[PDB]
Amino acid sequence: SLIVTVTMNPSIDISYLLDHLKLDTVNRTSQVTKTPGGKGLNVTRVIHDLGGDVIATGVLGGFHGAFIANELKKANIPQAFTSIKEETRDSIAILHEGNQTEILEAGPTVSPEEISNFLENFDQLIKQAEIVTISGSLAKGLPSDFYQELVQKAHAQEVKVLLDTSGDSLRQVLQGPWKPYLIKPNLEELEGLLGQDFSENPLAAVQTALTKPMFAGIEWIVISLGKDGAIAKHHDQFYRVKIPTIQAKNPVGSGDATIAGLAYGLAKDAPAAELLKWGMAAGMANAQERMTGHVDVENVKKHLMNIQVVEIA
Amino acid sequence: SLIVTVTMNPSIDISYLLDHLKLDTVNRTSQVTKTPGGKGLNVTRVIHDLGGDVIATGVLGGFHGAFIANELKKANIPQAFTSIKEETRDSIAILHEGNQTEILEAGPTVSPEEISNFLENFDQLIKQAEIVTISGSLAKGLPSDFYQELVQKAHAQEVKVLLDTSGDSLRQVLQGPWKPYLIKPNLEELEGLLGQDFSENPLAAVQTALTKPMFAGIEWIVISLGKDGAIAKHHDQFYRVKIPTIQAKNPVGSGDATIAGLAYGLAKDAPAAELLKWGMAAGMANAQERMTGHVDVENVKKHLMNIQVVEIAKEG
Ligand SMILES: [Br-]
Ligand SMILES: [Br-]
Ligand SMILES: [Br-]
Ligand SMILES: [Br-]
Ligand SMILES: [Br-]
Ligand SMILES: [Br-]
Ligand SMILES: [Br-]
Ligand SMILES: [Br-]
Ligand SMILES: [Br-]
Ligand SMILES: [Br-]
Ligand SMILES: [Br-]
Ligand SMILES: [Br-]
């Protein structure tokens, strides 16, 4: 069943491997990777790797956008981005001595007319979809509540929204009458929403938090806890998800991978326990890969066997 | 008269102003510029700013190369790059707390077929030029003596080459039979070649060094001393060029600007003293700009009036 991903501020992700980062001087390297990035494209790639039926949308501009579209084509990832005039952004990640120093650009400005063009395209794509993922930053020009329009449209088409987003904005979706099917805030995200501190006995705190009016009407809530696995709520059932303590190279985007695994599970009508395993197993496989937004499916399937899902009273 | 610039490893110069650079953490900015870059493209933009008749060549690949081609079109800078399959590189300059941390990519590999294709295009181009500038780094795949072949091709059309390169790529030209019209090594570059150090006050030593066999056949030699001006040699005439002190906003590329000034002076048949002044004044105007490869032509013309060209006596 068709999953649509949304990436409103896609990036050429540039990754530099450096022995040492010498400040105020020239650092040379031939250890460079340039990859389609932004959270929604990390998601897209993982779903694609899992064998899911995905199409990527969002906005792409200029030669940078054309580079991304061509990379997606070479990978045989179905895409249906909307064109904009301004250039798609670059993101820089510098890897040096265990450090990850990053530079994020604000990105291009999208015009009201381009926003209208994207929404028309979004309307057509979601007619054929079962699931939509919405995550990541908004390009400039987009109204701070852009994602709520997207949730409302999916609702009219009876499409399940996986919303992996944060802050004041996520709060405004949750405040409104059109609920996402699934949300996946991390602990700091959740602390931000509730204006609450969960540093002491986080597991017990999260279980209380998820009973709050904030979260009413959301079918699935999945809170990743890193090595502690997850706490989740489906309607009135709380779950604890316990995962093996694995050797975890690059954690960047294991959260985009979790969402991909969750979308993939939903797409195949996985029961609750299985759905939570696809999520955790994808996040796990991703962390064992240098490439962000990439898993090997055989290793995912392996991790599925060693995750425990526990119903909490 | 037409000046052809050569950039064998062009880049998108990406510059970020951050008030703080924070290691092992995400740094956000909307202060970003992406510009056609590589030493030859710095040269090109300054020549174009000065009002010179310029055309840029080199190699451009993929979507990053197409981006460079497009920015030049928007600038109305004529171009005649040849295509390669691999993507044109990016360069990163992070500006933070006075500093300039940079990351340079090795860049694309040019194939033997692609080199041939460049050289065919170059031959035609150079039939239309009076002057060619050759600067900067070679892309992977090019042999270390590549610039020598470009000098040889220029000579076949009586085109004057200004060569601003270092290390082996310079030394192989200097050891060989095809001599550029002008070279512009800085003191340190001069030391490396010779394997000497220079004292405080290096004029006597430079004078002696430039009469050595490896510099024979080169009509102009310009040794930049940065803030302290230049020492130059035109055939058997030595010169000291004294320049006004300035408040340098950003010195980066000011040797590229100097080469642009020298090329512009040559193209207008400037006599020796005027030629040297154009070079110095462009270098100075560039240092006064935050943007790399850019000059205010009115700063340049003001500087021309405050530079002293001093002829030095020989030997006896
Ligand atoms: Br590289
Ligand atoms: Br890809
Ligand atoms: Br993003
Ligand atoms: Br939101
Ligand atoms: Br609440
Ligand atoms: Br930006
Ligand atoms: Br260069
Ligand atoms: Br330009
Ligand atoms: Br150089
Ligand atoms: Br040699
Ligand atoms: Br004298
Ligand atoms: Br004399």
Swiss-Prot record, chain A:
**Pathway(s) the chain acts in:** Carbohydrate metabolism; D-tagatose 6-phosphate degradation; D-glyceraldehyde 3-phosphate and glycerone phosphate from D-tagatose 6-phosphate: step 1/2
Would I find DNA damage among this entry's keywords?
no
Q: Which UniProt keywords apply?
A: ATP-binding, Kinase, Lactose metabolism, Nucleotide-binding, Transferase
Gene Ontology MF terms: ATP binding; phosphofructokinase activity; tagatose-6-phosphate kinase activity
Record InterPro entries: Carboh/pur_kinase_PfkB_CS, LacC, PfkB_dom, Ribokinase-like, Tagatose/fructose_Pkinase
Q: Which reaction does it catalyse?
A: D-tagatofuranose 6-phosphate + ATP = D-tagatofuranose 1,6-bisphosphate + ADP + H(+)
Q: What is the recorded name of this protein?
A: Tagatose-6-phosphate kinase
Please report the organism this UniProt entry assigns to the protein: Enterococcus faecalis (strain ATCC 700802 / V583)
- Name the encoding gene, please: lacC
Swiss-Prot record, chain B:
Q: Which GO terms describe its molecular function?
A: ATP binding; phosphofructokinase activity; tagatose-6-phosphate kinase activity
Q: Does the keyword Aminoacyl-tRNA synthetase apply?
A: no
Gene Ontology annotations of biological process type: D-tagatose 6-phosphate catabolic process; lactose catabolic process via tagatose-6-phosphate
- Taken from the record, one Pfam family name reads PfkB
Q: Name one GO cellular component term.
A: cytosol
Taxonomically, which superkingdom?
Bacteria
- What keywords tag this UniProt record? ATP-binding, Kinase, Lactose metabolism, Nucleotide-binding, Transferase
Enzyme's top EC category: transferase
Name the reaction it catalyses: D-tagatofuranose 6-phosphate + ATP = D-tagatofuranose 1,6-bisphosphate + ADP + H(+)
**Matching PROSITE patterns:** PFKB_KINASES_1, PFKB_KINASES_2
Question: Which pathway does the database say it acts in?
Answer: Carbohydrate metabolism; D-tagatose 6-phosphate degradation; D-glyceraldehyde 3-phosphate and glycerone phosphate from D-tagatose 6-phosphate: step 1/2
EC number of this enzyme:
2.7.1.144
Which protein family is it in?
Answer: Belongs to the carbohydrate kinase PfkB family. LacC subfamily.
Can you name this protein?
A: Tagatose-6-phosphate kinase
Q: Which organism is it from?
A: Enterococcus faecalis (strain ATCC 700802 / V583)
> Taxonomic classification, please?
Bacteria, Bacillati, Bacillota, Bacilli, Lactobacillales
